[PDB]
Subunit: 468 residues, 4 copies
């Protein structure tokens, strides 16, 4: 053995854990934050031009976007000379191919215009949706910047923005490899109005490859034009590692991946034989409730890890033609998904360690604890949970039209979590509503602690009496 059985289970668990830790350490590159930070500082913090003070992070109108797209954008994207024409950003980043700019727009006449306001206003442009999307050519046709291209022909996928979710098709244009031609193309796009009252979003896409450390970086700047006015920017910088098997460390990581696959295969084959007939109530004590989930997530990882590594050359064929736009959005998306899945799996694997330290003599210390709150901490918490949601609803209804922290109801939830801890922005809350604001704040911060003390006293009293 019994002790021998638990000891062999322990040792195989530590081998699994150390393999997973090695994999995570290897996959996590060192000092990769500074790469993205330099990219973001270059493309987001420099003023759009010498005179005015606004940058991409603080954009307010369409003219600001036009100034940015021919000002700081071209200056930070095409670097003159190293001492050919390759545009090594920061002298060592090698802008790949050409950037691409894309526009999404809707149709005129998409309201039910009020009859009273019919002789003054003549046209509408509703908020973005697939039903309101425009598909007709406009302006001087003369190319692909004025002709709709479907999401299948326009080789790409959708994207989830702040205001809505965008299709991934529309009117696009591929810029050139040098500064002068891109400047001319942007000037032509500005002369013949390309953004006029129907535009709902604009994407800018490009990618660079640092050679000193082999890492690609995918940049997707997005500017959203609401139906009300103004702009809303977003950047989403993301590094990638496509070319692998360069040093012995890479082969070591590949071997670690193979042995991890063997480990999880052994776990799943051993777990399934333990649920066959014996222990039909196997899903209890919650420890089992974890150990299946692990392998589940594990196999999902393999899926992604197989679906994204075997489809790089079919997309890295850009190497044969360095004069087009390389699509790297899918690789970045799947890299992000794999990162999230791996982080969740390692977190759960780490917390599964308690299964073994319990075998000693921590039953009372732990056992008792986890058993003395199943219907106590989770039984008295219904009242605070209801009051929390009621206060969130009240805050969302009162505020949320004046305060950014109280729009988008779910965010209100988070805001309350930051009010209890001490992250408060009371100035704007009080400014928005001079009567209900302070009342809400004081009543919330008082009632939360009052009911928490009631909970604690009730647990103490009740428990004591029960064990008296």
């Amino acid at each position: 053995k019994y002790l021998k059985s638990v000891l062999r289970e322990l040792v195989t668990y530590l081998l699994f854990l150390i393999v997973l830790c090695i994999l995570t350490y290897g996959m996590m590159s060192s000092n990769v934050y500074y790469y993205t930070r330099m990219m973001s500082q270059l493309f987001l913090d420099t003023p759009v031009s010498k005179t005015e003070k606004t940058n991409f992070k603080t954009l307010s109108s369409m003219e600001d976007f036009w100034k940015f797209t021919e000002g700081s954008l071209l200056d930070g994207l095409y670097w003159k000379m190293q001492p050919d024409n390759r545009s090594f950003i920061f002298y060592e980043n090698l802008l790949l191919g050409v950037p691409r700019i894309r526009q999404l727009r809707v149709r005129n006449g998409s309201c039910s215009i009020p009859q009273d306001l019919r002789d003054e206003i003549k046209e509408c442009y509703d908020v973005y949706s697939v039903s309101s999307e425009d598909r007709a050519p406009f302006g001087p046709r003369n190319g692909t910047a004025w002709i709709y291209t479907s999401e299948k022909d326009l080789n790409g996928s959708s994207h989830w923005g702040i205001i809505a979710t965008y299709s991934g098709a529309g009117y696009y244009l591929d810029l050139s490899r040098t500064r002068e031609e891109t400047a001319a193309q942007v000037a032509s796009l500005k002369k013949n109005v390309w953004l006029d009252r129907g535009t709902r979003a604009t994407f800018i896409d490009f990618s660079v490859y640092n050679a000193n450390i082999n890492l690609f970086c995918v940049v997707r700047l997005l500017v959203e034009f609401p139906a009300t006015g103004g702009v809303i920017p977003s950047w989403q910088f993301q590094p990638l590692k496509l070319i692998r098997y360069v040093t012995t460390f890479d082969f070591f990581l590949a071997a670690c991946e193979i042995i991890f696959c063997f480990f999880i295969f052994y776990y799943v084959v051993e777990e399934i034989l333990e649920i066959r007939i014996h222990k039909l109530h196997y899903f209890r004590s919650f420890w089992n409730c974890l150990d299946v989930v692990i392998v589940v997530l594990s196999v999902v990882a393999i899926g992604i890890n197989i679906y994204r590594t075997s489809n790089v050359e079919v997309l890295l064929q850009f190497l044969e033609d360095q004069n087009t736009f390389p699509n790297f959005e899918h690789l970045a998306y799947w890299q992000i998904q794999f990162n999230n899945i791996a982080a969740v799996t390692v977190f759960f694997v780490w917390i599964k360690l308690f299964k073994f330290i319990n075998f000693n003599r921590t039953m009372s210390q732990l056992s008792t604890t986890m058993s003395r709150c199943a219907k106590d901490l989770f039984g008295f918490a219904i009242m605070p949970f209801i009051i929390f949601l009621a206060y969130a609803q009240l805050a969302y209804l009162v505020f949320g039209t004046q305060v950014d922290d109280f729009s988008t109801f779910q965010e209100c939830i988070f805001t309350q979590f930051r009010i209890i801890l001490g992250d408060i922005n009371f100035a704007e809350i009080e400014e928005a509503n001079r009567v209900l604001g302070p009342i809400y704040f004081t009543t919330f911060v008082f009632f939360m602690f009052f009911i928490l003390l009631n909970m604690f006293l009730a647990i103490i009293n009740d428990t004591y009496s029960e064990v008296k």
Copy 2:
């Protein structure tokens, strides 16, 4: 059944709750925050002109106000051309009618000037009050900007400002529909001094209507001139929705309103029949103490909801003449009142859900919990409540002449709530008073926790000992 009776009460309560939730979701428009945020950024954050850095949010003198009123105000209010003379703000907002500027001022000679300073100073202008208000013409009469107009003729109401509450009458002027004429009028107002040492407040009012989503926005910029000097700005943007019954969703909301009225009528008739003779002590257990309040607030809502929907066309008759100033202050005020009332009602309805969950075996968990502490938390808390107010009084007397967070005594209360949580501005507190400041801070944060621990220990001791 008895169980059947509580079950039918439960089901009717959930129907009422779902109807109320549908009403609140429908009345709360989506992404309406960005409309106000764009408006405020355009009219508050842009510098008053190209050279100096000050904006409306940071105004300091009368000359700054004069620069703003002919600089960033006109630039962000009259937009040149879309590719007529209609000034579509952000190309899609349609400034309605003309803006209006109004001034409130007091009379010379309103002190009891000290006899010693009688040959040194000659004139006074007291703080604003209805008793000190001026009503005589001044300067070149030549119109309504130099002649007092009563609050009845000047079609409007009062307003509650930071310093005082203002009447709503005074000297007003209606600007024009184009940039040149308004610029000329403002230049004429500046030449023949319109603001001179007697002015106490200045209002700027206008409204826009977005057609893509039918919403009005009412803007009322206010600048207060204290008797001491300087200016104090206030903006108070507010979106409004007048034209309804546009899509089927609006008719669905109307049906929801009707059925909600029926629901609350049923509730009130049931309450009044249950309060007739039996249970003359009906106002106990506190649950009843809530269920009447609900219907009370409910009927109040209807009042507002009826008093503001039937008085739109008598005020929207602006549609027949698009060359005057449309008064929308009353509609915005009543919309705000309705929003507050509805939020409070839904909060109370949500917290009334506990009445049913206690019928299960949870009733023994809120005995001690919601009972017991009736005279324990509410009995031991008199000492902390007194100490809190004593510290607030001390802080208001010591500080409050140097620190903005400690003026206006009630605000001191709120400041203390932010000191316990962790929102502290210790730099200015210590700078204002280098001896009493730190002493107050440390003694407050120590004594609060000390007395809280004493409360908790005393409650534990009494509970245990009492039931020992």
Copy 3:
């Protein structure tokens, strides 16, 4: 009772309390914060000139001080014309008399210069002290700006600065009533070097009087020149009220003062007759320990209230000659002292209210507690009190040369109070020391909570066990 005796004591206490509350409300003027805020914004936030961005609050060198003293200082102090020569600040503040500028400096040759660095360094100027103070004339004598004047002839007193405490004598100059002559005088002072390597402090003093609300404001700007280099500014704006008995409210306040004096005389005579022979152990139960202190502080107030109101005309004689510098420093100092004393007295009077509420059935709720935690909280807290001071000493020794929050050891104490609550500036702490910083932070925040939990658990265990 007996009940009749406690009832008459209660009613006389509430009469005393309401009299004190009326006095405090009357003495606390309304919206007096905005006066000081406008003054400080005008004299501290405006840039020293159009081109440079630095202001008085952020000064770094002597040239910056020279730019300020002939730039924003003169611009915000002499206002051209209202539509004579009176300089109404903000058109309504009436600069009184003339401003005065004063300098304090030390003697050359006040080191014990190291023998090694004797051929490279020739002169010293030690830190400021009365022993190192200079008293000899320098430069072109030609007036009082280059001749030392004693603290008795130079009619004034000392001042407590950030670096040291300054005497109040030195080299002074009285400016003029108009802009041109003061500009000429400052230019002459700058030409013939007035600040050169020996200057240790510089004071600028003036005062204004608002006529709409009778209030004086005393301004004393101070710039300190350390022995190391640079400057350190301080402002100390203070509103003052000299001319009283203007409206009936003032006479009401005078009557309230008289009746308060009668009240405290009655209290002190009752206290002294209650201590004659009976109750030689009178100083117990701590309630008596309060009620004498009250009257003590009370009489002190009268002293100040009599020492500052009877010496106004002997100093307001400025009214007969409006061409000199009016000394108002003493009046402001005594006003501040009176404010502090009054605030402390009202705080103690307010907390003395518990003496009556305990006579009811509440005596069993705090009798127990105030005979219990007496040696439990005040006996178990010696360990946290020692650990707190040890950590403060460690932080002061490690930091304090790089971080402003950890110099001046007492301030370290306050910083720790802000770390527990959540006011943290971890960036600079970690930057100053990359190894000891985080170690100190984590160990402090862990050990504090650990020992607090041990304290509370020990009290619980001890209590229960004791009364088992």
Copy 4:
């Protein structure tokens, strides 16, 4: 003894403590923070030149570094004239000798370049390491700025930077004593490219000596060039005190040092005679464990102190030749080490005071206090400790490529300590990941408090049952 023995132990402990406190007060100079603050403000906050807004603290490119090194650096380092050529910074700091600039760089061709990207990329420059370091001359040789000099010939040591640890050798150049020649040298270095794609770090070193208070200040500005691009600055200002025995206070401190040596000798001899044969289990009670750490730290501190006080003149021989670069890095390093050691020793000495207070009737309060939790708080805390590290691992894996607070895994630990207290930067966390961010935040802040409350309930119940 017995009481006599503990009393003599007490009195000798207080003599030791007062001697140590005197030493710490003496070694800690007063108002030495302002010296470093002025230096840092002068050399870090001034813009690199008049037009652009960037300073040393915010540098982004190589051109910014070149602008700084001939702009604000020369302006704040060579001061024109006092009313010779000595460059008294702030007129009273006496720049010592000449500054020195040093560069570290790597070799071309240090990748394993992918075969696919072989016709597009030609050269590499790996991250800095001793293996990749370059040692060949480059450019026009013509001096020592283009020729490698070993760490032994280049008289200096290593340094621990943000990105890596640097050797201390490389290509250096000694500037001149006047502004014109240094400007010419920097212009020549900029013309013939000195920083080109291989540079990995750059050091600037100089030192000043204030004569009014005898203190040296050592400045070492460092700029790191990552393999990705951009720059990362660091300053590390440090005041130093070399010339001692100037006043009687210095001799008093020397006598204190000698007597403190005598105290530790007496303590160590007593401890060694108390461990000879009797009490072979001597290492218990935590006092017998603390008092040996005390003496170990003390002897280490004195070893360091006597190692650095006798190693000054062989390095201060700069006095004979004021035309070279004085090396003060070692003295500053050992001063920092001594300060850290002394602070730790005094902290431990202060906390050792508890040994005596428990001899009174307080020992019954320290029993439960310091034991009833030996296996109770340290036994129930394994679960929170594991969950904390699991959450840190999850945060480091998810974030850390987008957020500066979540890179460098150990820092994540500290970040969590600041989230519980209330120091939160939720905006960037939510922006980096819009799904996992809020989930991580809410789950962490909920589970931490849940587990803490569970611990407290479990320990209370357990203790109660045990002593039932």
